[PDB]
Antibody, heavy 226, light 210 residues
Framework: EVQLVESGGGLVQPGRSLRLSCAASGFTFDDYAIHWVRQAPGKGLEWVSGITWNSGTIGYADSVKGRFTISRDNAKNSLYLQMNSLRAEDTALYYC???????????????????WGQGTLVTVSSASTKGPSVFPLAPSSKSTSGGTAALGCLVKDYFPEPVTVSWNSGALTSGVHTFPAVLQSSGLYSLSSVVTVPSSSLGTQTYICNVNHKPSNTKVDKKVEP | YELTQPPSVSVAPGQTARITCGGNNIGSKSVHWYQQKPGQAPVLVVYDDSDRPSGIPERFSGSNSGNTATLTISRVEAGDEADYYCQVWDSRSDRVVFGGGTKLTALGQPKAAPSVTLFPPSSEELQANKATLVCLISDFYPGAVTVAWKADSSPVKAGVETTTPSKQSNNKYAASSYLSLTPEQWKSHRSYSCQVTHEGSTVEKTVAPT
């Protein structure tokens, strides 16, 4: 139903500017309020700003005034946010939340979120973007149970983490164990996944691990072989 | 404004929990609640202490009395472990004051034996020098696990390691291990393997000595 597509985010130097966008799909973009609220990793959330159903600013926090500028577009049905003078304490997942009430003319000021999105990792540091390195992990012939064999990818050497993996075309939502990344004392991270991988009898997947990385856009279509 | 929330509240899955959010003079302003699962997107629960959204069962409820808003969850289960946040408006400052959510963890769940997984180096990398050996572990409930490496049939921990903490995945803990301090000639001898020492019994897995 509600599809709040969020775009904009990556690795930028401290002191630059960027533009995040949130496009709505499913409802009418004339009677609902939409807010931007960041979320630090494992350190709670933090409301950034918001705009009501019409072109109107509701306010900001005590540490984001003068640097951020939020705007609304009812012609294109999109909420934009321009960020300037980013510092080290601005690394969080900026979520684009909607509002439940229709925000009638005469009421009380009480806005609460109803729908949430996915968020975009907007990191601010002095490091540079690195290109991923996909490797075809060997599906060794250790066969004891039915699905004991498993193969995956070995993506590494990447500072930002826009981890989005797909096998063939964005399907096969079965049991897959996508291990989270970890900073190996150098700023880089590592990604790995485990699939079922049944007995290979020409009736399995194409053995393709496509990883999408926005700051390091590079279409890798390398196959995996035993 | 400034809300005070408990750091962590654990309760067995037999009774109800107590998640309280209080302030200074919050007795009439509306109080909303949200439940964010680790990794997924947040969802709306009983808000304003007088109504619930579409889909939320009768298990969730809210009650405000003077200066304390309590979120009562009835018949807490394993699938209800998430981060609960309480939101207030505070029209005096024209802001949205959030607070440190409470990590509700149902204490008293059955154990889960983790399974170790070994992925040998790929075929199209020996011509280069990558040295990205990885040892994985399956899902397990009891966290705080130390992955001990047995490099060349000997304890070698001086190399560069990762030691990632146990993350959240379908109400389960998981991690990985990376230690390839070798000169990239890992196929030397004596069956380079991997181990994992959990609370109680430990697991091990070896590969072909070639």
């Amino acid at each position: 139903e509600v599809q709040l597509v969020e775009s904009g985010g990556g690795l930028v130097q401290p002191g630059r500017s960027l533009r995040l966008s949130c496009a709505a799909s499913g409802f009418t973009f004339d009677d609902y309020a939409i807010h931007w609220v960041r979320q630090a990793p494992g350190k709670g959330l933090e409301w950034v700003s918001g705009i009501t159903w019409n072109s109107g600013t509701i306010g900001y926090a005590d540490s984001v005034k003068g640097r951020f500028t939020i705007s609304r577009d009812n012609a294109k049905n999109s909420l934009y946010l321009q960020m300037n003078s980013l510092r080290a304490e601005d690394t969080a997942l900026y979520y684009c939340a909607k509002h439940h009430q229709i925000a009638v003319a005469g009421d009380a000021e009480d806005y609460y979120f109803d729908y949430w999105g996915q968020g975009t990792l907007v990191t601010v540091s002095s490091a540079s973007t690195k290109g991923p390195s996909v490797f075809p992990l060997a599906p060794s012939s250790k066969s004891t149970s039915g699905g004991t064999a498993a193969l995956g990818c070995l993506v590494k050497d990447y500072f930002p983490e826009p981890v989005t993996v797909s096998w063939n075309s964005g399907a096969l939502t079965s049991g897959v164990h996508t291990f989270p990344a970890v900073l190996q004392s150098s700023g880089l991270y590592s990604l790995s996944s485990v699939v079922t991988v049944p007995s290979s009898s020409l009736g399995t997947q194409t053995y393709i691990c496509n990883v999408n990385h926005k700051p390091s856009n590079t279409k890798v279509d390398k196959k995996v072989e035993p | 404004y400034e809300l005070t929330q408990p750091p962590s509240v654990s309760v067995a899955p037999g009774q109800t929990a107590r998640i309280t959010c209080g302030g200074n003079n919050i007795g009439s302003k509306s109080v909303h609640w949200y439940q964010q699962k680790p990794g997924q997107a947040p969802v709306l629960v009983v808000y304003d202490d007088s109504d619930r959204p579409s889909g939320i069962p009768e298990r969730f409820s809210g009650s405000n009395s003077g200066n304390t808003a309590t979120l009562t969850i009835s018949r807490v289960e394993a699938g209800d472990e998430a981060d609960y946040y309480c939101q207030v408006w505070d029209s005096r400052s024209d802001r949205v004051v959030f607070g440190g959510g409470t990590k509700l963890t149902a204490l008293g769940q059955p154990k889960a034996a983790p399974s170790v997984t070994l992925f040998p180096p790929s075929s199209e990398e020996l011509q280069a020098n990558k040295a990205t050996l990885v040892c994985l572990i399956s899902d397990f409930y009891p966290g705080a696990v130390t992955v001990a490496w047995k490099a060349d049939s000997s304890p070698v921990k001086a190399g560069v390691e990762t030691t990632t903490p146990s993350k959240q995945s379908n109400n389960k803990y998981a991690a990985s291990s990376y230690l390839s301090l070798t000169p990239e000639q890992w196929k030397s001898h004596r069956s380079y393997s991997c181990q994992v020492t959990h609370e109680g019994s430990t697991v091990e897995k070896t590969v072909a000595p070639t």
